Design a protein around this nucleic acid. Sequence first.
RNA 1: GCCCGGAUAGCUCAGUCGGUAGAGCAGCGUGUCCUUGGUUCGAUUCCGAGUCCGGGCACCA
Lengths: 1183, 393
Amino acid sequence: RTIETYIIYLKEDLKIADTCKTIKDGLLKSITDKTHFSEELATYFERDNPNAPFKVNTTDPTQVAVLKKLLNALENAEKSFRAIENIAVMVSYKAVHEIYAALQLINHSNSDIQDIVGPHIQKLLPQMALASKALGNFAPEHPEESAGAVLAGVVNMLPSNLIFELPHYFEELQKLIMIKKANETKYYFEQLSSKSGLLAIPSYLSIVKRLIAHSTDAYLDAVAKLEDIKHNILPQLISELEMVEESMGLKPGLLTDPALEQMNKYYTQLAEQVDNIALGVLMDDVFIQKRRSNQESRLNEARLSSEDKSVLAAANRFFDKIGSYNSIHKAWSKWSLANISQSEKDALIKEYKQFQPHFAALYPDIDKLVVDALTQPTGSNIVSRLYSSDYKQLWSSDHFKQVLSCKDSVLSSIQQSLAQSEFKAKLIEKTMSHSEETAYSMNNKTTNLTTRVQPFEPLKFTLEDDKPVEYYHKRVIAASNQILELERAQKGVAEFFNYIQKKYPLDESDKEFLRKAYKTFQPQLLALKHDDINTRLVSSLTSSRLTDLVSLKSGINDYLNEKISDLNQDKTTLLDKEEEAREEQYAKNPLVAKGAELEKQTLFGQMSKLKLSKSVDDFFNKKFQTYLKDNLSPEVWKQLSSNGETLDFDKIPYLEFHKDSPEVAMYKQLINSMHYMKNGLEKLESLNDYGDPNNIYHRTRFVMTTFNALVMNICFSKYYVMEAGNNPGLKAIVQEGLDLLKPLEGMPLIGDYLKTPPKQNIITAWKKQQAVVESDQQLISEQLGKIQEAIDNFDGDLEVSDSAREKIKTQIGEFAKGISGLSFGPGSVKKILAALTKLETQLSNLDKESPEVTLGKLKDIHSELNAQFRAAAEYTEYHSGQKFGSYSNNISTIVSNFCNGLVSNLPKDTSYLQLIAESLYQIPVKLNEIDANVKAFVEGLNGLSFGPGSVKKILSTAAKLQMQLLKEIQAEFGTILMAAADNAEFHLGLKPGTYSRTVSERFEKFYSIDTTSTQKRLAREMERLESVKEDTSAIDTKKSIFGTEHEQFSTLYQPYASLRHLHAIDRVFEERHKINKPSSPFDKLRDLYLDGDFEKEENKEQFLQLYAELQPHLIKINYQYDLAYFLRELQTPEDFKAATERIINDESKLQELITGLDDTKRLKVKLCEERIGYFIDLLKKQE
Amino acid sequence: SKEKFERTKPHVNVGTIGHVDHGKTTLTAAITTVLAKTYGGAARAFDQIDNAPEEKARGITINTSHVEYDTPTRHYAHVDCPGHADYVKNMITGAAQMDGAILVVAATDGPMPQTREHILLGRQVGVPYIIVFLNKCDMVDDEELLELVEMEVRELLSQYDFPGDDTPIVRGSALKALEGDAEWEAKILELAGFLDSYIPEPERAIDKPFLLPIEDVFSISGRGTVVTGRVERGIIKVGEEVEIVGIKETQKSTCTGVEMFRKLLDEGRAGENVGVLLRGIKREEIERGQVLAKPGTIKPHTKFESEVYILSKDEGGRHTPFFKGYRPQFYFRTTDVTGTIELPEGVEMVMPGDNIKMVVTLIHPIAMDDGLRFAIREGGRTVGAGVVAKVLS
RNA sequence: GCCCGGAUAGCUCAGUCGGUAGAGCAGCGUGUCCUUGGUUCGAUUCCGAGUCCGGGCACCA
Ligand SMILES: Nc1nc2c(ncn2[C@@H]2O[C@H](COP(=O)(O)OP(=O)(O)OP(=O)(O)O)[C@@H](O)[C@H]2O)c(=O)[nH]1
Ligand SMILES: [Mg+2]
């Protein structure tokens, strides 16, 4: 029964298998887009069959390995959960913690991967948390283990900036082209420099500020500024953009080509403006030169990192030496690395210094064990080291076995880092080729030569012998860049002298190829004594003997070959010296554990180091409760603070909420949300602090669950804060508190994490829940499947792409979901099935007719289906006891969307305030920008009700203003706003005056005798008090629950209840209805419990009706008295009996609710009298 | 064998427990030699305790050793247990014969994982008293470190219901005392006095039916098969009939001689570490974990309801939950049996640190009764500790 | 007691870079690979424990 409940909860409430399938499909479709990601990354995720797992190799990049592991984990979890739906606790636990292992992989996963992956994996984090919570009640109950908030309705809250930023910025700069150019710059700077959240380019503010400053402005200074922009600023921005896109792995030029076009247009227009005031091509020679130099520097970085083999060799030597100990030698060392000889320790330290980061990233605790075993002196005792308990547990283990168990993972990590560097080098090569193509295309598809090019300068090295690593590394990279330059020059020579031979075995036609070939090796040809040949060839190739330049081909080839050889020899020497310097710097530095420092940066270590709990607590204790004391009326403040100036911290987690006023309950819930947020943040920071130097931190998948649970709690509480922030009197402090939690939406493993209601018949709802437990629809599903297979089997002349097949499959799925909850009338099923059969025949005959007849027929089918589904939805609405026009509109919308997709893929009081602002701002402009002021006013005054009479007042005053187009109209608008603000203040427990004065000040600021307005407000307050005194909510609810016969019925029912627990005993049971006839739903439920024969359906329906009557009051007593989960558990008659007993036992709490309503009236009259006293005091003081 | 084992002093069964390499064997040798210097004694050496070739090769104690020594008022049978985590089972067997345990904690190390594990296991196999010997105090001149170790050991003892604030702690040096440093032999004498005073003379059940858990089986050439162990209750005499109950089918035999530390005994009494010679049984028909009982007085059982505490990760237990069908090893006095676990209704998994009431069905019948404490071990670690709430079948 | 090696269909066995177990015979295989856990994105496969079986050491109240 409990296992069945868990299975149904997984299948229908969480739908975890479907969520996992959707996330996997979206991730795989995004990382194989080929329009957002390069083919290099996409080829790694190609599978012979979709049923095989992705194979993680030692030769694939690090990020490719992480993505493959995540996809495999998602597929395995989907398989396990689907297998669960086909029939359990162990299987679900294993699947949940496989997802958590994938999440832990993401936790340690190189923020590029994090931003690639987060938008998809954020969709199942709450599902995983809820699944873990549901699994938790199959374990023995642990009181106070969590002590968190009650997740009442979490199931109902289950849920291009980078490529558009720079083009938008340069478009804005294009728009910035006496006093007109003095505020536009300020506006642009405020709009753009404030933007953040995507500044992966770690200079962005500098470029935006410098570009704005330069765009604000003899001609020598202007030319110098232009060259500074063209050669220093924009090339650096483009290089950083390429760095971002290379680290991401996107296709070349994805976010660099639109940006490049934008800056090209901006620079061309700026240069044109400068020329008009008194060169500008953005790709003259040196922009290209600097771009290619940066590209080659990055390429050589990647190639050097990929061709390095010292770290892998050191790791292999370390693991071989550790595994060279047999059982006897391990026993002699007492299975501890600290007991080996000093020379062996020195060799092990020398090996371990070279690959410690890789070992420590995967094994932060084994790293500390190795460091302490190898570096500590043997004389020191363990006691003085003050090791922790779990550190001592690891210390007592077989050290050799512990280290040897890390070998495969560490070697795989090292080889995958090398593969990542090689893959980055390939990406940089693709970026270089694409940049060359775009540079060719952007100017004219033509090249221009110049004889004023500085010749080649083959660098020579006179280098020191006792310099740091970077000293030699810079020279190595310079030599490699020069090697690449000479290599491309010799390639150009080969192309030049091959095209010359193949085109004519100097007055030619296709001189562009020769021009572009000679531009590559012009500096090298100028390096030799051939300046005359160069100046005779540049002019001849730009305006016009080819039999003489072919003579000096072998000479220039030999020059290039010898220069490359010399550079290679110098590179080898420099690499040797750099390796020696690396060894020296490794020997100088002592060995120190690195695991905790690496764990401090994963994803949750970064969040923990923010200390958000401290700021939240400071706001809660100093800024929130101070505002509560200052603004809340004393009557409301009494229920929250028994000390008069501080919240009642002895009872902060309030749990009743049904003995309080709606405003008091709202404030208590807000306090609960803040308290739970603070506790969750503090727990999360405590679990992710790694500041103990004497402790180890084991990396495992079984902590993420805890993390997720904490996150859920925090987000849940934060959700309510936003719900409490949608109030006129609470917007400011709530917004401040949410601004404090701003650095949580943005971390990939939290995100928004949450969402950020029908009324049908009780019998219908119970039957729906019973149907969803026990799981025409089959007929329509089969018809949709036939339609889908007819579309798929379309092999006619009208070719249908596989993308269109996937799109129509998605459309058919959405349509099936939409119509799966639809009841059809007599004959409606026949009509809809005939229409769908005709539609599928038309789809099978798409190519048999002209497109016009096809579109007409499908439009007729769409109209017929829409009409039939409208009628069927109206029938279902009537028979389900719902409101007309609600379900029918949704069904028709689903049908219309489905048909539109099929035809496409086959070849408010806020409005009142806006009107008020528009009229008030058009009044002076028509009797003497606007949109921004109106929007600001509406946003600042969001949350007013305006009632049903003030609407007519507003309309009449607007009509009077229109007729008249002095201060009477503004006074009427102000008093309408003041009445609305008074309503808002009275709905909360706010002290009179505060929010009304705030809104009045805002209104009068936007605008740029009082006794009458004060008297009007006072009259409003008096009439409000009169209305409040006439309220009879408490007596009405008492009558509705148990009418004016409850005491007598209870007195005459108690003996019957006692008799419930021989032959003539049934006589009194039969005759009780002549003396104890119930008159209220509670007494009727008591009588039904007396009957006890819940096997019959008549009393089951009677109980359902009584519960329908009693639910709006029971839902306040407890949240479990809902209409979805409470009805789902009513399956057997014993369940009905248990529900009846549970409802009967809550009579005391219902009475408490009625007394709470009476107290709510008692508090409301006091608030009204306080407001009236304040207003009369203000009127008497104002004279 | 030759002598007759004159019975003069009350007999107590003590033994050394603690983490590996902390000085249990050295402490046993030092105790025996110092007591042989001050009193009669026998002066066993270190090599005579760890005498097996494998123990000498690996340099660790593997199997429990047995020595005897006499204070003026008591006669002690001392069991030296292995400290290595791989041989915990052997230690458990030794800890099943202990009326008292000397917890050897190295001052250079402090309490370690096997210190806590041995405390818990000795608690589960019936060790009621623990005396702490702070060993290697010749290498720790600091007094603050000694106080810290003392308080840590006291907290650890209190964590498992021993009177940590009342347990005597001796700051001594087994190696120096064995060498002959009189200032450090005074500490061994103080430890012997604490053995005499702190550990009360146990109340033995010499009237109940005879019962002896088997700890070891020997094949004495020319005599037959001898089963050694501590008589839990009753008296076994030469010529009496006994039954071997437990793992295999129960056998019947007769007692043809009782010995005690290679000295002939007329009758073996409760609480005494004796060896019983059985007539006409091969060494392969008996095993450790079986029980010698009076005929028709013990019925082996396979199923029982128990209340079990599952250790947390920080106590050396599991870090993941287990479900139905979990098949760990259950350690009763000298017996270890594989058993299957059935969880109570409404419970499908048990987290570390939980208290559960589960039904255990063993794969072999064993002798057990209500109130018999046991340990649960799996994967080379202790995962739980429970008591037999009641016997089903 | 301490090592070592095996256990895969009814029988005989292959499966080793960890990616859903297949060949013959017997009459087209829910055999998750003796069982239990652990590691792992993923276990017949790697680690541990346990149950049997086999054969090498130890011991000797
Ligand atoms: N300095 C010093 N060393 C000691 C002392 N006691 C023992 N040792 C040394 O510690 C080592 C531990 O040896 P054992 O006493 O046999 O270890 P154990 O307690 O039997 O632990 P197991 O090997 O599991 O049996 C010995 O080689 C001694 O040399 C001591 O009091 N002071
Ligand atoms: Mg020993």
